């Protein structure tokens, strides 16, 4: 599943391009329920097998999952079949970036219904995608969680309309994307940090080959004013551990 990625074609997540000889090489299941993984422990599910515009061994993903789960174009895209999920009942009426730029109305009939072709949003309940009719730049955070896992929803039942606008600060407040490249050249000791956190990095198997873990507890030493918040948050969203800074 480790393979190169295609450039952008459209601007909709409801249409996704396709590389059919690479699916002939691999084993990927049907359509709407296919998992893609990557950075910041973010599991995401959307559609594949739909457009077939580009060539083999490179597949177009949507721009909102180009900036999320990777860093830029030309990265390594991974695929995973995640089938047989249940059916949800009318996820979000609540957008989180551009409610005040326009009119509210019915708060879900206005922007979701002209911009779909029976793609009933199998996205994480709290994940983002730009969706609007005319201006086409309204994100959302999902508050309706009728299914627990990554699931599509049933066509057009009824929910409430409690959608209120918030400033778009939540993604860089709670899931701020940092990597090895996002610290300005500390690779004299960033390599040491990566060595120390590699046994915490999803690896119980080498614990019997290590005896006790040498990270019983790690102290960061630096001058007053260099800051250590993003340095300590670097292992967050690269290991996926619960951060909970105090």
């Amino acid at each position: 599943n480790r393979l190169i990625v295609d450039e952008a074609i459209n601007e909709d997540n409801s249409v996704v391009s396709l590389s059919q000889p690479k699916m002939d090489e691999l084993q990927l299941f049907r359509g709407d329920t296919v998992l893609l993984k990557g950075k910041k422990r973010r599991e995401a599910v959307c559609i594949v097998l739909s457009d077939d515009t580009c060539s083999d061994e490179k597949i177009r993903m949507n721009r909102v999952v180009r900036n999320n789960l990777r860093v830029r174009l030309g990265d390594v895209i991974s695929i995973q079949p995640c089938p047989d999920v249940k059916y949800g009942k009318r996820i979000h009426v609540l957008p989180i970036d551009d409610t005040v730029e326009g009119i509210t109305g019915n708060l879900f009939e206005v922007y979701l219904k002209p911009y779909f072709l029976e793609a009933y949003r199998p996205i994480r309940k709290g994940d983002i995608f730009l969706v609007h009719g005319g201006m086409r730049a309204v994100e959302f955070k999902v508050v309706e969680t009728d299914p627990s896992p990554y699931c599509i929803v049933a066509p057009d039942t009824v929910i409430h309309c409690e959608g209120e606008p918030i400033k778009r600060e939540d993604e860089e407040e709670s899931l701020n994307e940092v990597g090895y490249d996002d610290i300005g050249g500390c690779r004299k000791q960033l390599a040491q940090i990566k060595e120390m956190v590699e046994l915490p990095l999803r690896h119980p198997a080498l614990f019997k080959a290590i005896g006790v873990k040498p990270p019983r507890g790690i102290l960061l030493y630096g001058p007053p004013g260099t800051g250590k918040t993003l340095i300590a948050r670097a292992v967050a969203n690269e290991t996926g551990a619960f951060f909970f800074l105090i």
Binding site: Q20, D24, L28, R30, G31, D32, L49, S50, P83, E118
Partner: protein, 108 residues
Amino acid sequence: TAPQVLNTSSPAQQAENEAKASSSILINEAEPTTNIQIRLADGGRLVQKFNHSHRISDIRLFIVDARPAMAATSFVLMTTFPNKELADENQTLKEANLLNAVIVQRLT
């Protein structure tokens, strides 16, 4: 919407029926084999066993031989997101772009 079919078959005979439906389709090793993926909307179960060059009527025969639940139930398959349906059952896979495409069991 329409009535569906539940798990009325035995669990020990489903793999035997899948093997019989796989052996019903002729296998040729002189062609690049295309793995046609079918997912049914009667509970989310999905199988795949096909050859390179066949027809949509052979896909219907494979669905009939796979399980006896939807053999007599009328069903129309479709591909998601061209906003189109799957007519012309005598057409081949390459002409109507059925190369490992989306097949969704839709009940009318």
